[PDB]
Amino acid sequence: IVLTQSPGTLSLSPGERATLSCRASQSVSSSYLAWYQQKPGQAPRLLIYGASSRATGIPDRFSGSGSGTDFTLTISRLEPEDFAVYYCQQYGSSRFTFGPGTKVDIK
């Protein structure tokens, strides 16, 4: 399974909504699709698992949706601490690969 992500880079202001896409080349088994946030100098932190479950402690402004091959991460109202690179990962089959990332930068 190959994951692609779009956009590549997106610059927004605090308070704006970000809509991030992840597309899988084949259906993802059981909706085992996760999303991570990586801030500079840190390991990625899990935001969403099973396509639409928020991980423990993750605020409700992050939302994951989708099934099959098309997945979306929405950040409803960006806070300054949300500017980072966001990755999807499929863990339903084969090598558990990552998408190439979407950089969400401050406008």
Side-chain angles (χ1 to χ4, degrees):
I1 303 174
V2 176
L3 298 181
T4 49
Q5 281 182 252
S6 172
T9 300
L10 180 63
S11 69
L12 295 163
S13 284
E16 295 202 279
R17 180 180 272 238
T19 301
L20 271 54
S21 292
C22 177
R23 304 171 203 317
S25 57
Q26 294 126 80
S27 275
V28 172
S29 303
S30 310
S31 291
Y32 287 162
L33 191 283
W35 288 95
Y36 301 86
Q37 175 196 77
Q38 186 174 38
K39 294 185 180 171
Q42 295 186 6
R45 177 162 69 94
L46 183 66
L47 302 169
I48 303 292
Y49 65 102
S52 59
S53 298
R54 273 184 288 139
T56 300
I58 299 300
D60 58 13
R61 70 183 178 274
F62 296 93
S63 191
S65 64
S67 285
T69 63
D70 291 297
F71 299 92
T72 303
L73 174 70
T74 303
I75 313 173
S76 66
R77 317 154 317 260
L78 283 164
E79 304 292 328
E81 50 258 63
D82 296 341
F83 297 94
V85 186
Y86 292 83
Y87 293 96
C88 55
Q89 187 188 25
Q90 70 80 19
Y91 54 101
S93 148
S94 265
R95 311 176 90 173
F96 296 161
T97 57
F98 293 93
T102 292
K103 301 177 171 170
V104 181
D105 292 337
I106 283 76
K107 192 163 76 194

